[PDB]
């Protein structure tokens, strides 16, 4: 049939590595605001429309309303930023509110797993993801650990929601 598209939106606090994860997925290196990539996930060829959290100076009401209708959401925090983790519930609540749905495909992502200065324990994030009924992926945009896994798990979650 037609090539299936997946609208993914990457949200999270500032500096947690959203753009870094997205650029690692698209261009496979570390160091614009919207990208599209053909991927093969579980055999199916899909078109990923990745919407990164752009800067304020790029604000447009059209893009805001368009991201309000995203199919999947990556909730990114950094393991060295306690406030980025403690504010994750705000992101979940407001995304569910703007989507007007109880079942919204989401994946919790703990980036910067390569760092030694951890302040958020893996067990805490696992407990939060379990209480939400969503997967939790530890990623590192620097070492590319778990990047493809996070985005592919989000695509899978969208596939289960669609059926």
């Amino acid at each position: 049939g037609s090539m299936t598209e997946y609208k993914l939106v990457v949200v999270g606090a500032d500096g947690v590595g959203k753009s870094a994860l997205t650029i690692q997925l698209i261009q496979n290196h570390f160091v614009e605001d919207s990208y599209r990539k053909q991927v093969v996930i579980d055999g199916e060829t899909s078109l990923l429309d990745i919407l990164d959290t752009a800067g304020q100076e790029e604000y447009s009401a059209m893009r805001d309303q368009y991201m309000r209708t995203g199919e999947g959401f990556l909730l990114v925090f950094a393991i060295n930023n306690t406030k980025s983790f403690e504010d994750i519930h705000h992101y979940r609540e407001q995304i569910k509110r703007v989507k007007d749905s109880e079942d919204v495909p989401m994946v919790l992502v703990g980036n910067k797993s390569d760092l030694p200065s951890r302040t958020v324990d893996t067990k805490q994030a696992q407990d939060l993801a379990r209480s939400y009924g969503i997967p939790f992926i530890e990623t590192s945009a620097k070492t590319r650990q778990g990047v493809d896994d996070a985005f592919y798990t989000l695509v899978r979650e969208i596939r289960k929601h669609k059926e």
Binding site: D87, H90, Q94
Partner: protein, 91 residues
């Protein structure tokens, strides 16, 4: 896209109710800090869901000037709105 019309709609000598109008941009949460004007005592900080437009601050002292500041964190855009602040004297 910045919140507007920050004001106190009710007060006791130990508590305030503050309110604002939300911007058109989707807000994930509002960051609120309050403390004695002039910095005699340290500030305190908390967050309020982006679906709310009010906040209740408790435990204040009578006859004291307080400064309340509000930031709005954007859901789909980096950073915060420019902070908005008011001064209020309890008694």
């Amino acid at each position: 896209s910045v919140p507007t019309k920050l004001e106190v709609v009710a007060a006791t000598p130990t508590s305030l109710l503050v309110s604002w109008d939300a911007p058109a941009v989707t807000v994930v949460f509002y960051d609120i800090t309050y403390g004695e004007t002039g910095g005699n005592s340290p500030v305190q900080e908390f967050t309020v869901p982006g679906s709310k437009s009010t906040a209740t601050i408790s435990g204040l002292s009578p006859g004291v000037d307080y400064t309340i500041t509000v930031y709005a964190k954007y859901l789909f855009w980096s950073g915060y709105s420019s902070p908005i602040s008011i001064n209020y004297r309890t008694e």
